[PDB]
């Protein structure tokens, strides 16, 4: 006579199958019979033969929201251990986002798109999870939508994005895509000294966590010119030298991330 299994439990429910876990019995095992059945006799039972080692078990192919009756026997020969015995129900039907994209970045937001198969929606769910060990952003969408934009977010960030089709409790499976915000620009352009050979430039830095900048200026009727070297992260002052006396520049600061450039911070000077 054998003992049962020990301890079982659910680790996971979807619309077609159900996850089981239990403690073996501390015995010589021949197998295991799995029986899953319909509690109401709206489908077909099934029944799976395991091998003696096993712990646990994945029944798939099952009837979408259905109570199941579920019996775990162990199996030594000719012998049978009474079942360890669970119910599950399973979830209503959900099917993941189709063709998941993203369309927009800016230093702020993300803009994504997304089909569906035409089935009954109650909503959509997207954690925007960024690289640097910040929290998630959370978000809960209409079940019309299929453009969606979270806000909110940080610049010159990388995010991966799980997109989740809700059908009331039934949560299908993330759809993974991969976006980065916009680099934010340097801002306050101040020119704190000026000669006519030369500038000093002055500005505040951007949020994002930028490798450098870039300095181009300008004078009509020639191309733009970048200071030499780049300024590195931390600096906020810059001299541009070897101007002509008496001429208006333009004077571009650009933040850089590797080889991400911010939008130009922009501003005017003479001599």
Known sequence: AIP???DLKFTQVTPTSLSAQWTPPNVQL?????????????????????????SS??????????????????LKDTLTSR?????????????????????????????????????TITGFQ???????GQ?????????????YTITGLQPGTDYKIYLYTLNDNARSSPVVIDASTAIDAPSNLRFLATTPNSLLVSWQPPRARITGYIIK???????????????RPGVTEATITGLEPGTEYTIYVIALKNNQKSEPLIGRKKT
């Open 4 to 6: 049962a299994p020990t």
């Open 30 to 54: 021949t197998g295991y019979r799995v029986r899953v059945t319909p509690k109401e006799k709206t489908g077909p039972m099934k029944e799976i033969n395991l091998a003696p080692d096993s």
């Open 57 to 74: 078990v994945v029944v798939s192919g099952l009837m979408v929201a259905t109570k199941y009756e579920v019996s775990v026997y162990a």
């Open 83 to 119: 079942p360890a015995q669970g119910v599950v129900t399973t979830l209503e039907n959900v099917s993941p986002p189709r063709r998941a994209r993203v369309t927009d970045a800016t230093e702020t937001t993300i803009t994504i798109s997304w089909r569906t198969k035409t089935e």
């Open 126 to 132: 997207v954690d925007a999870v960024p690289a640097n």
């Open 135 to 147: 929290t998630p952003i959370q978000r809960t969408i209409k079940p019309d939508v299929r453009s």
């Open 217 to 231: 200026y300008e004078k009509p009727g020639s191309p733009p010119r970048e200071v030499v070297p780049r300024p």
